[PDB]
Swiss-Prot record:
Down-regulates signaling from heterotrimeric G-proteins by increasing the GTPase activity of the alpha subunits, thereby driving them into their inactive GDP-bound form. Down-regulates G-protein-mediated release of inositol phosphates and activation of MAP kinases. Binds EFNB1 and EFNB2. Binds the GNB1-GNG2 heterodimer. Disulfide bonds: none annotated. It is found in: Cytoplasm; Nucleus; Cell membrane. This is Regulator of G-protein signaling 3. It comes from Homo sapiens (Human). Residues 10-127 form the RGS domain. Phosphorylated by cyclic GMP-dependent protein kinase.
Amino acid sequence: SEEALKWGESLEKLLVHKYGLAVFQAFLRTEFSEENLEFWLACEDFKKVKSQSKMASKAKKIFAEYIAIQACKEVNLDSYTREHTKDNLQSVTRGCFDLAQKRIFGLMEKDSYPRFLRSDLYLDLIN
């Protein structure tokens, strides 16, 4: 089982495992919150982008899909974080989504992650 037990250490540790990510994703999908994780993962790709022109258009892409009110993949963000993020689009740097990313990290860590650890998808893998 073994690898699975490592996802139970913390959400930080689940999130760097290929297969934990795939299973956690399936779980989040059963409660219709899988866009939290997808957004979070898009923030991590974004922070790997080298090019400034690439950084700026990728950030613009992320905003239109996950952040903008009525976005197909709209994540639960407040006016404070939503506006902050929107402001950051004028001069993109790699801190652009830190606030948004931490808010959404926080929701998974506290809410859906413990629920995952109580799920059959999770437990059937450790026994």
